[PDB]
Design a protein around this ligand. Structure first.
Ligand SMILES: Nc1ncnc2c1ncn2[C@@H]1O[C@H](COP(=O)(O)O)[C@@H](O)[C@H]1O
Ligand SMILES: Nc1ncnc2c1ncn2[C@@H]1O[C@H](COP(=O)(O)O)[C@@H](O)[C@H]1O
Ligand SMILES: Nc1ncnc2c1ncn2[C@@H]1O[C@H](COP(=O)(O)O)[C@@H](O)[C@H]1O
Ligand SMILES: [Zn+2]
Ligand SMILES: [Zn+2]
Ligand SMILES: [Zn+2]
Lengths: 255, 255, 255
């Protein structure tokens, strides 16, 4: 427990200006304004439409591997998924020489698409698939994820060997690999500021990385439309703002 | 592997008398005599009545959030849940200046109700709920958990923001947060005796905390109606007694 | 990321000849030639026949404890399960004084049956069961696992106390215990070579043990019919061979 003081976007800017190695921790909050639904119970959740028991678990995948591809296929095709100002904001913060890494739980690859250089994907990424028998990795893209694509024509997509392609994202019942977790630890260890942007709703890999940050005495700044699990627990400051309002911050540090 | 020697309640008393910083690790065994059912396959289990696949998992909650509230509501209302002698025993052991902390896996808050001061709740606690969209925390009590209460009138209970209240307890598919685990580690690290009371049936957070205790060369005493996973593995002594027979021990150290 | 160079069986032999403390990490790949099906989506998988949601999870066990015993009973009875050359190969490598431990994820106990001495069973073992109320451990064998055995006559098998026997293997929703994980760490820590044989298909306990191995700068050799998750990530060399082709290696080092 500790005191988390609310500050303003312009106050945050003043904090960042002094720092030299900023890391951003990002969850579904950073993608909401790109029309990507969340994956918990946040009202804007994907689980309105699909049963998580069947569509989101490894044992659900083992028995009905097509279903998670229906999910991915539908989202890619039916929603106007594009970069938002927050992503442009972050990208320019990296261009300005302050933001060094982004550890994300998002599977949409938007940070990278924004022009950030070092993106650690805790929950994997929807643009890789892996054959479940021969381990062939195939890198995908928007076009191959479309409902009319050849790749999507027969579900589940099949490897040349005859095996079944699994999307390279963490499902319910899978743990994040140790080495990926360490890459995230290693980046936080050497940071002088941590932005927890649009995440920490609930205990998760991200919460634990925030705890790690406290243990390492790192200044934490929370940017979120609401309070969260780490507020008055591990975060030092809180900025109540939507992700896209970060352009307010990028503009100031540009001048 | 090692030798776990069975001792008597009065032998245990002689051990405690010499110690200065006792920590108790407690599971469902400490609540059984308060008519709280267990949550495994121990015959007195809650899963006779409810399907764990639907009533006890986060993905089960995401799709049917009312169900776990039916569970909590029914238990609170239909069983005579009260403190037992074991809880009074522990409370007086803390009053006598020997017992410093209790790490529990129980979600019933009985230890606290007993008058213990430092209770670390590994699996959360049934007297807090959290809005799944705005993260508002609401502290509950017996009265609000009753089937006739306003809080329980519409399920799932709704936050003012319009969001859905989730009970603050660990479900199947959720991991215990790192910081909560550390608070438990930190307490064991500085203890000179560990009482594993009414738990360790199976590999669990509690088993791992016992392993941690061995690694830190701490004297472990098991109190349980039967042998368990840590017996002749990590525990140094075993007292075959029901939780409520601890008053035999408290009475002796009182004089 | 790093370079994994493919080598030959005879090249591997030349590597082993120089080492003094070899540890083998083994998964379902080592048992495939004994007709034991895998437990993922590898085409030869057990989940063709059974629903993992009901037959393979702890919550599935709590509600329908007979089902996993049907699984074990059917496999034991209907498949010609015997040691293969790879197991004989490993056993002789331990006889030749090179191979010191085997950390396995397999639940079939074949390594031990091969005549290896130190087998650490990450996912438990199908030849122990434990009463879910009194924790009585019963050691089983082939004969007791047969469909006509007394043990298998009434499912789930019942403990004398009246409780229900649970097979001593890790199910979906259970974590590997810390102390078992440490025994595996401790063995790798002091090894000078690690053979990842027939495993590492996907992120798992085994992958994490490979990561641990890198962190400890240990030479890793992969033996598998295909590439895997650790290839060009953590493994130093790769031998593309079936498990049973290890006799080629054992024969050379025998002379
Ligand atoms: N546009 C947004 N900007 C910032 N945070 C958001 C936005 N939309 C949702 N959130 C937050 O993102 C978090 C999502 O957490 P999680 O679903 O656990 O990754 C919640 O705490 C939301 O309050
Ligand atoms: N009245 C009691 N006193 C002490 N131990 C108990 C009592 N009732 C059940 N137990 C034990 O509590 C443990 C429950 O373990 P778990 O369900 O894993 O928390 C089992 O090992 C039981 O033998
Ligand atoms: N006969 C065999 N010899 C060696 N590796 C095998 C054999 N059969 C299957 N495999 C491999 O074993 C691994 C199984 O991984 P997992 O199912 O994750 O334990 C896969 O990478 C397969 O390519
Ligand atoms: Zn393939
Ligand atoms: Zn709310
Ligand atoms: Zn029994």
């Amino acid at each position: 427990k500790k005191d988390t003081q609310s500050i303003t976007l312009e106050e945050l800017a003043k904090i960042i200006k002094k720092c030299k190695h900023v890391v951003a921790l990002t969850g579904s909050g950073t993608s909401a304004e790109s029309n990507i639904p969340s994956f918990r119970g946040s009202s804007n959740s994907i689980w309105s439409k699909y049963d998580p028991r069947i569509y989101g678990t490894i044992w659900g995948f083992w028995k009905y591997p097509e279903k998670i591809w229906e999910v991915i296929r539908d989202i890619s095709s039916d929603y106007e998924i594009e970069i938002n100002n927050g992503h442009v904001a972050l990208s320019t913060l990296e261009s300005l020489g302050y933001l060094k890494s982004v550890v994300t739980q998002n599977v949409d690859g938007l940070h990278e698409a924004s022009g950030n250089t070092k993106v650690i994907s805790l929950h994997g990424n929807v643009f890789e698939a892996v054959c479940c028998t021969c381990n062939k990795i195939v890198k995908l893209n928007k076009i191959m994820l479309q409902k009319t694509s050849h790749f999507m024509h027969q579900l589940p997509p099949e490897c040349p060997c005859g095996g079944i392609f699994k999307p390279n994202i963490i499902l319910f019942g899978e743990v994040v690999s140790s080495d990926l977790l360490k890459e995230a630890e290693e980046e936080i260890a050497k940071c002088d500021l941590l932005l927890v942007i649009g995440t920490s709703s609930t205990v998760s890999t991200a919460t634990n990385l925030c705890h790690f940050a406290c243990k390492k005495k790192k200044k934490i700044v929370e940017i979120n439309i609401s309070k969260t699990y780490i507020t008055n627990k591990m975060s030092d400051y809180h900025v109540c703002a939507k992700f896209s309002e970060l352009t307010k911050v990028a503009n100031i540090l540009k001048g």
